[PDB]
Amino acid sequence: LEDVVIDRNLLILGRILGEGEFGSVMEGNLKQEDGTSLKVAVKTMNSSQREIEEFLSEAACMKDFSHPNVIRLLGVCIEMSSQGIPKPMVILPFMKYGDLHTYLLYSRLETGPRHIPLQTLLRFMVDIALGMEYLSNRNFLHRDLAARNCMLRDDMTVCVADFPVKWIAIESLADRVYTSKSDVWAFGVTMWEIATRGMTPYPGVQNHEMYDYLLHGHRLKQPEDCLDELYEIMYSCWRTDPLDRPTFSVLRLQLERLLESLP
């Protein structure tokens, strides 16, 4: 696990981009092998070796993945400054359009991007499935899929990243069992988020009420002018039993099929 480490001296920090988990997300430049520097994103933190490990364990696993619709890892870095304290860093690639959730809301404004049509909205769904199909076929659970954690690439392509009660599958709220079908649930609500153009899920119902809300058979409503075929797709990701839920490998094609049927 030494191919992924990059010397700190090859990196400079910039402005704070957002606030992520137990750390800060800032901008910076990374000197590459070929001279050129690159705009990147860095996740900075300590709780003994218990927050260091859980932070550098996503990195050690996420690292050797390859997919266009899954965010890639450019390197991890270790600061060790001032008081005799090591602090770690995760070089992530820069996205000049932020995450999909925020970009969805901006579309609603004049200064924001244009009214996003269905094909573009449906396209984003195809991208997330592709990446979620990838991590599925190689036995990785995301455990936190949401348009908040789906950045937008400059080619208007979506990628999955940042490895929330309204997004937990019903069985995972109880049996503490997160599986690849618990992801299928989350991808269904993320499909709702996108169709609404940024609405907080389950309006009216509150976070604690959610378990009883699901155990009685209440799922998300069909949004305004969301197609029938599209809602029955995201509804199918929600069936009470995990094994009756379709998979990422099937969701993608039905989505890819639906997009073609439009002008």
Ligand X SMILES: CCCCNc1ncc(C(=O)NC2CCN(CCCF)CC2)c(N[C@H]2CC[C@H](O)CC2)n1
Binding site for ligand X (CB under 6 A): 17-18, 20, 25, 41, 92, 94-96, 98-99, 151, 161-162
Question: Within 160-209, where are the H helices?
Answer: 170-175, 180-196
Contact (CB, 8 A) for 81 and 87: yes
Determine whether the annotation assigns residue 122 to a binding site.
no
Query: Considering the complex, what minimum distance in angstroms separates the CB of residue 41 from ligand X?
Result: 3
Q: How far apart are CA 159 and CA 218, in angstroms?
A: 30
Q: How far apart are CA 160 and CA 215, in angstroms?
A: 29
Written as six digits, the tokens of 87 are: 């602090």
Query: Considering the complex, what minimum distance in angstroms separates the CB of residue 160 from ligand X?
Result: 10
- Coil vs helix vs strand at 204: coil
Query: Considering the complex, what minimum distance in angstroms separates the CB of residue 220 from ligand X?
Result: 23
Determine whether the annotation assigns residue 24 to a binding site.
yes
Question: Within the chain, where are the H helices?
Answer: 48-62, 100-106, 118-137, 170-175, 180-196, 210-215, 228-236, 248-260
Report the residue number, 160 or 189, with the smaller CB distance to ligand X: 160
Determine whether the annotation assigns residue 27 to a binding site.
no
Which residue, chain included where needed, has tokens 């073609």? Answer: 260
Determine whether the annotation assigns residue 217 to a binding site.
no
Determine whether the annotation assigns residue 253 to a binding site.
no
Catalytic residue among 3, 7, 64, 144: 144
Report the residue number, 162 or 171, with the smaller CB distance to ligand X: 162
Across 90-106, b (16+ Cβ under 10 Å) vs e yields bbbbbbebebbbbbbee
Query: Considering the complex, what minimum distance in angstroms separates the CB of residue 113 from ligand X?
Result: 11
183 part of the active site: no
Report the residue number, 151 or 214, with the smaller CB distance to ligand X: 151
Report the residue number, 92 or 194, with the smaller CB distance to ligand X: 92
Closest to 130 in 3D by CA, of 6, 233, 244, 253: 253
Provide the annotated binding site: 17-25, 39
Which residues are designated catalytic?
144
What are the binding residues for ATP?
A: 17-25, 39
